[PDB]
Amino acid sequence: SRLTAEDINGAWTIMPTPSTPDASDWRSTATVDLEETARIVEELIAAGVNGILSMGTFGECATLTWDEKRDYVSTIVETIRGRVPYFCGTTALNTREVIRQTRELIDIGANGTMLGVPMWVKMDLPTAVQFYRDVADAVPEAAIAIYANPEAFKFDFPRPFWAEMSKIPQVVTAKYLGIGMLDLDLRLAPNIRFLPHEDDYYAAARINPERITAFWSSGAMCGPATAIMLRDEVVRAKSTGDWAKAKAISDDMRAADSTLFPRGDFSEFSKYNIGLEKARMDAAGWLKAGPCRPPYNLVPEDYLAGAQKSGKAWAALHAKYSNELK
Amino acid sequence: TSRLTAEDINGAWTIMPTPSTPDASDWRSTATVDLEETARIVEELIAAGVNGILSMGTFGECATLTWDEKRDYVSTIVETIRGRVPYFCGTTALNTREVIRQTRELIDIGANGTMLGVPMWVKMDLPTAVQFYRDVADAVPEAAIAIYANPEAFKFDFPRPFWAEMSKIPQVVTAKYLGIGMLDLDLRLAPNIRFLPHEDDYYAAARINPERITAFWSSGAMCGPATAIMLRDEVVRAKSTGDWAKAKAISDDMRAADSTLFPRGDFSEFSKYNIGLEKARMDAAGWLKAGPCRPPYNLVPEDYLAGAQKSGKAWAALHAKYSNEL
Amino acid sequence: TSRLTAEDINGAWTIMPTPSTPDASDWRSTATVDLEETARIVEELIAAGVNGILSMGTFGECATLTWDEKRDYVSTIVETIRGRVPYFCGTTALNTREVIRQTRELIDIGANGTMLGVPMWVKMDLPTAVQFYRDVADAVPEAAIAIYANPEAFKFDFPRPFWAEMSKIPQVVTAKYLGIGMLDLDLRLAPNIRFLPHEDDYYAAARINPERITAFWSSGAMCGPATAIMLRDEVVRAKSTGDWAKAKAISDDMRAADSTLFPRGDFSEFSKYNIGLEKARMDAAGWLKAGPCRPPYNLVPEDYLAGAQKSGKAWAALHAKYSNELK
Amino acid sequence: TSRLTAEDINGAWTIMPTPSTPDASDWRSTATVDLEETARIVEELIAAGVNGILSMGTFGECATLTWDEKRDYVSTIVETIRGRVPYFCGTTALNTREVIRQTRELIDIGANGTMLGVPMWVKMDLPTAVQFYRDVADAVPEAAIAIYANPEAFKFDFPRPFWAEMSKIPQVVTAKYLGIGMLDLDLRLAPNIRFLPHEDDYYAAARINPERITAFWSSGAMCGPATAIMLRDEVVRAKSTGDWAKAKAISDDMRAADSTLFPRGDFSEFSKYNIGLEKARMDAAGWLKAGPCRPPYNLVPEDYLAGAQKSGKAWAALHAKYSNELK
Structure with a gap:
């Protein structure tokens, strides 16, 4: 049966596409x-x-x-x-x-597609809505995860867009970004499981514990114990009202991410999103992400150190939390 | 069938649409x-x-x-x-x-070359963009390349050092260029490229550098090519006689015909509806049938259509006027 | 006598206009x-x-x-x-x-402090912005400072390390803050600042950190303050009882009232007409007379005015509703 | 005695700094x-x-x-x-x-006019910007106005219809202009304005419209004015003879001298450090003493300073070269 929002809970980890050693060469x-x-x-x-x-x-x-x-x-x-x-x-x-x-x-045999919008030409609101309607009409058995990335896809996935998506049964979840308007988006789109980024899960789950039961993780590719412990501890916090441990895990996650962006600059991160993520995973040692496919196979060396340091920090979290999961 | 060079690129270069059947908006x-x-x-x-x-x-x-x-x-x-x-x-x-x-x-x-922008899901940086064009030219050495220098579509802004690097690639022979604010410098940086200004800017560019600026790109020709042909011919004459008055009058007519194309005079709005607006203008002009837009870019606000159609009629009027002069 | 601290900043902080005479648009x-x-x-x-x-x-x-x-x-x-x-x-x-x-x-x-943005003719960078606030606090040590974190007006975007630096300046006691996407981190970086979310975001922010988020800033109060007072009071009760449903209903009402303020829902357009739109909304609400805008910002597209006036009427309606629930 | 008109604006128009005393960075x-x-x-x-x-x-x-x-x-x-x-x-x-x-x-x-941008705390729209200049001209009818068309500083982007409106204001006689992409059209829309391109663009602009483009603005002159004077004189000769080669050589020298000014070739970075970079380049050139920057814009990353200083040296070298050619 097609997945629904009800079936989307806990730690949702985004995996890379592992490369062979020659993958940078056209x-x-x-x-x-x-x-x-x-x-x-x-x-x-x-x-x-x-x-x-x-x-x-x-x-x-x-x-x-x-x-x-x-x-x-x-x-x-x-x-x-x-x-x-x-x-x-x-x-x-x-x-x-x-x-x-x-x-x-x-x-x-995939259950759904994590789907952004065509981006050669910047989409407007009605175009973007009809795009998702068209895909859902054409492939009714696919669940859709809205890939809400304005840097990549230019369109900024605004409030009224979420209201329209909630009318499309196939749209069951969203890979979401900053949570400044999560409270409103939750009200506008009752039928979507909004996935905050793992670092924002703590805050989002406190905003709306009934609706915010899941999150997306890239840090798990450096060792998943941290994400699993966050998941488990947030479940406990919701029951007990004691949020201290969940807060400590979340704060550790933000620290581990603190060196990833070149000079703390997101626009610079956006340009090197592929190379920086894959480099951090390579440095962490939990998996081998490997070289980037062309054209995005060149990253300034100085930016690599920050990604590698983040990878090591996440690996250290994985070691720490592995032991706390016993 | 020997490879085009910049020396072979002169006069009026017209950019044609891809004509649509009536059902072309339907996925x-x-x-x-x-x-x-x-x-x-x-x-x-x-x-x-x-x-x-x-x-x-x-x-x-x-x-x-x-x-x-x-x-x-x-x-x-x-x-x-x-x-x-x-x-x-x-x-x-x-x-x-x-x-x-x-x-x-x-x-x-049997195409002679490719008009080629850069991959745009992720914003390219300078060395990545350079290597991209090097890679294409390495892989397909028989293709001439026209740099499609469109920062709105492709995010990358095609800066000065990029042009210096492109001039070292023999396959790169021309550029579909935009604003002429840095044309004088770009000509110096890239001696081996025929820079094509947009037709409305050809008059000014040809006066800047009459030796180098011998060609231009035209979309207005899709509403009737006589205007572009007359501009071309009259600029040749102006370069010989030093009397630029007629070339200036044609160029001024072209800018007036374009004056209603952009929604509220706003280029960012034009960029979102670049496909629909261009195709609508051509349909209104009646010289060719551009036809419906392929999904997803098949919806244009009705108020924006009037400006495009008015521009199409203005260019059709120019074509009638200049047909009589040729 | 003694300088305000973050501990003294709680509840509903209302931002008032500067009322105009009828001739105020004329240079x-x-x-x-x-x-x-x-x-x-x-x-x-x-x-x-x-x-x-x-x-x-x-x-x-x-x-x-x-x-x-x-x-x-x-x-x-x-x-x-x-x-x-x-x-x-x-x-x-x-x-x-x-x-x-x-x-x-x-x-x-006799003002207790200044709500202070950064000089914006030239876009400031991080060290220059930090030194600017250090310079003001050094020069006027008795002034409390509210950081006016408005990137549209002031170009500088008030980033994470900026807040960490401000928390070392005793005079910096509060911030007129905007989106709460990085509030959790900013609170950790800046323990000594009372971060004021916008009223519509207070519900969410107070649930993130109920210990730290005890206050908010309100412009909707200029259309009748009962709504802000109700929100304040009900959030205090929610923190004690754990029952957030009433606070949520008030917060949802507030967001609906704001829903027509931005021209075509566009914040960049709101930013251009921030003065005229706010003053028009207050004029429509009838609780106070904000009056004409001083030059040059004395022209707003007529179509944008209706959305502001509709928002003003919605807030006035909230004030009547919550006035009755207070009393 | 009488107010300047565009007809009176020709040749090399040099923009000078405001020289600082040694203590000028201190608030x-x-x-x-x-x-x-x-x-x-x-x-x-x-x-x-x-x-x-x-x-x-x-x-x-x-x-x-x-x-x-x-x-x-x-x-x-x-x-x-x-x-x-x-x-x-x-x-x-x-x-x-x-x-x-x-x-x-x-x-x-006793100034003849004001070089005037727009109020920028709030981004102006087109009718607001137009009325602003109308208001100033109405209030100070004896002042000539030079439109300071700087979208980075002033947010407003000085579009085509703006220039058409300015041409109806007699007091508006010139513009400190930037990129020349739309100069051809702006000249048509605004017959009564002497558009000043930046010196590096004067060569190209003068070839576009030699009748209208008779003047330019120079900051490079603050590193020694001989280059600007030689450009001016050689462009006059080029317009008469049709031989543009020497004007082209001078213009190309100017662009090379500017080539290191922008941090990492980035204009947005230049815009943040516009004051410090310009003043540092002038200080390095040695023709005048621009001196320290007034607060807050008194800190520039050291790495960016070298590029400005190198540009200052390059302009000083041009001044030496062209001084000799004027003799």
Whole structure:
């Protein structure tokens, strides 16, 4: 059966698309490390993750070939064997390409697509709404996770957009960003499970504990124990009213993220989103994300140190929380 | 079939749309190019005396055509031209490998070059953008490249040092250029590129540097090419005689015809509706049938349409006036 | 006598306009403050039970008042308040020396602090912004400072490390804050500041950190303060009982009342017409007379005015509803 | 005696800084203008053969001077010039009434006009900006106005229809203009304005429209004016002979000298440090002493200073080269 918002809870981890050593070279044709892909999936399931996202920005949806995408998703689906829900990503330059990709990946066995908007031309509100309506009409069995990334996709996913999305049954969740208007968006869109970024989960769950039961994590790719402990401790906090431990975990997470952005600058992070994320994962040692596919295969060396330091900090959190999970 | 150089790029270079069938706005439609209208436009342009044809930029719907549509369009163009004028396809895509794949196939069909922007899901930086064009030229050495310098679409702003680097790539022979504020410097930085100003700026640019600025790009020609042909011819005469009055009068007419195109005079608003507004203007002018916009960019606020249609009628009026002078 | 601290900043902090005479849009006019309306507003706010008064931000026309107008306005406010609640003037200006000059005079008249943005002709960077506030606090050590964190007006975006630096400055006691996306972090970075969310965000912010988030800033109160007072009171009760449903209902009402204020829902357009839109809404609500805008910001597209006036009527309706629930 | 018109605006128009005393970065300092260096600069510029003097834009620290400093600076300039060349003060301020007050006093002291941007705390729209300049011209009919078209400082972007409206205001005679992308159209829309391109763009602009483009604005001249004077003279000759090669060579030298000024080639970064970078370049060139920056804009990242200093040296080298060619 198609996933609903009710079925979206806990720690939703966004995995990279592991690269072979030659993946930066435009001459290379099959650059997905399929075995590393399988290994990551089993490790996430074993850690107790609730669901898997993939194929956003750092997941290199932009720079994988179609055959690579099909092979990656096939490997994921075969590994999961129905044990947890899985979202592919099918953001593309036009509605027809999105539909083509979405139908094929769902057919292979993804449960849904994490889906941004076509971005060559900046979409307006009615265009963006009709785009998601078109995809849901065309592929009614796909769940949709709204990939609300204004830097990548130009459109800024405003309040009235969320009100419209809540009328589309297929739209069950959102990879959400800053929580300044989460309170209102929750009211406007009762049928969506809004996923804050892991660092914001603490605050969001305190805003609305009934609705905010899940979050998205990239930090888990440096070791998932931290995300699992946050999940578990927030459940306990909601029951006991004692938020101190959840707050301590959340504060540790923000510190670990503190060096990721070049000079603390998000616009600079946005330019190097792929390389910085993959470098941090490589430095953490929990998985091998590998080289970036062209064109986004060059990152200023000085920016790499901050990403690597963040990776080490998250690895240290994973060690610490692994022990607290016993 | 030896590779175009900047020396071969002169006069009026007209950018043609990709004509749509009546059902082209519907995501269910699979073969939406009117191939006969495509052939008719090409022959008409050749008959008008155009120097070269560009295609498959933003309003040309490079973003929203399917690959089979693209191949069919280019095939029809190549068969129609039968080597009589140079022809640039467009192969801007999400990643370097896809660009290369598309560029190889379209050049193989018989385009002379590609009008090429940069991958834009993630904003490129300077060295990434340089290496991208180096990679394409390395991979498809037989393709001429026209730099499609559109910062609104592609995020990257095509700065001074970028032009210096492009001038070292023999395949890069021209640029679909925008504002001329830094044209004087860019000409010095890139001696081996024929910079094409937009037609409305050709008068000013040709006066800046009459030796280098011998060509321009025209979308207004899709409303009747006589105006562009007369501008071209009169600028040649002005360069010889030193009497720029007639060239100036034509150029001023062109700016007036463009004056209602932008919604509330706002370029950011034009950028969002670049496809629909251009196609609507052409439809209003009656010289060709551009037809409906492919999804998702198939909705334009009604009030913005009037300005585009008025511009189309103004350009049609120019074409009638200048037809009588040629 | 002693300088305000964060501990003294609680509850509903209402930001008042600078009432205009009928001729206030004309550059020829010289004394455009309705000083009696100013006095009447202050007494009405105190009577409603407001905890403190802010003034002289953007809609308060700090940019467009003359210096004599500012001195007369503040004098009237100080003499009306008679020490009963704390009061912040505003002294944002083009340079540090002018800020200091204005701050010293208005504090001397008897304001307790200044609600202060940064000089904005040139976009400030982080170290220059920090040193600016250090310089003002050094020069006028008796002034409390409310950081006026408005990136649209002031260009500087008031980032995380800025708040960490401000928390080392004893004079910096509060902030007129905006979106709460990084409030959790900012609270950790700046233990010594009372961060004031906008009233519509107070519900969410108070649930994030009920210990720290005890106060908020209100412009809706200028359309009738009962709603803000009710929100204040009900959030105190929610923190004690754990039952947040009534506070949530009031907060939801407030957001609905604000829903038509921004032209086509666009904040960049709101930013251009911040003064005229706020003053028009207050005029429509009928609780006070904000009056015409001082030049140059005395023209607002007519279509944008209806949305502001509708918001003013919605807030007036809330005030009537909550007045009855208070009493 | 009579008000300047566009017809009177020709040649090299040099924008001078406001020379600082050594203590000028300290907010405690009250009289930070080096009035003798001011007088020296003015006489040097006149001696070099400059056609007019502009002052009190961004790097000229209109935003950070006190009023007494501004009056003293302008008084010194007026008494030095003794009517020999036209002089524009600058009176950009936060509101129309302040602009008018300042403009009346500085024109009264003896400036011929004001180089005037728009109030920028709130981003102006088109009709507001137009009415602002109408208001100033109505209030101070004897002042010539130079439109200071700086969208980074003033937020408003000075669009095509704005120039059409300005051409109906007789007092508006010139513009300190930026990029020339739409100069061709703006010239058509505003026949009564002498558009001043930046010196590096003068070559291109003069080739676009040699009848209209007869003047330019120079900051490079503050590193030695010979280059600007030679550009001016050689462009006159080019227009007569049709031989543009020498003008092109001078213009290309100017662009090279500017090539290191912007931090990492980034204009947004230049905009933040516009004051410090310009003053540092002038200090490095050695032709005049611009001196420390008034607060708050008194801190520039050290790495950015080297690029400004290198530009100053390059301009000084051009001044030496062209001094010899004028002889």
